[PDB]
Amino acid sequence: LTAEHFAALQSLLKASSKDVVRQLCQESFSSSALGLKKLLDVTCSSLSVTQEEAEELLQALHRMTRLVAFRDLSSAEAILALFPENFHQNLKNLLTKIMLEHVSTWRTEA
Template sequence: MAATISSEHFTHLQLLLKAPSKDAVRDVCVRSHREPGGRLAESTAAALSISTSQAAELVHSLHVLSHHVVFNNLSSPEQILDLFPTSFHQSLKNLITKILLENSPTWRTEAAGVNVSLPQLTHLDWRVDMVRGSDSVGHMSVPTCLVQFQVEDPSPSAGTESVSTVTVELSRESLDTILDGLGRIRDQLSVVAGK
């Protein structure tokens, strides 16, 4: 979730008034979205003739603002302008808004590409077995279904395999319940796809 924007963030953004050009403002805004680290703070401090700590606060504030715009899908100038306090410098507010609007579609696409997603089913296998007996019952004949799922994790954690296999044993009643649920999902997907 995106961080909340505070009045302190907007105070730090006023430091952009010291920028030598609009291109310098654009450069800091675009780079702060992707790399809000120390090197950017140092180069920003040199470009704007401010201290490194002020530059770090400015870069962080720009980072928070750009992520807020992307996370909340703000796509009109009015939506972004409404974020700024009324006392904020008008020309700088308009410039930042313009830069955010120009870059947010690209940032949104990049964010969608790197976000964590759920594991994907890659293979499914099944078989029906007959359980003939157990420790408690000497002879029985109960059919069960063994379903083997092979899933791939698109973003595995360090030291784990990206593909894992899960085997599930289902009774006839459990299988009926699952099939009924999958039938409902299929019907809902058909309705949505038909619209």
């Protein structure tokens, strides 16, 4: 949403001074917790999925990526092991591949 985004920036005209918006822009950047909305919109636009349904996937990816990093998994057949037997094979292998390529760099981010 970039059209109704500028319709939100206009609310800055309800401010009291140029000092409050000066401290409001500084707090809008460093607070990276607001980056989730950009992640949701880019997920809904790339997968043609609902906002509520995009939240379920992102939590799943977060949960699994954190998991393979926590246990420090370098084994391919170990990654494949936690996938259920009735899981889409090509997607299972695609994920497994991505897990292996980033399991090193991800663990450093802790």
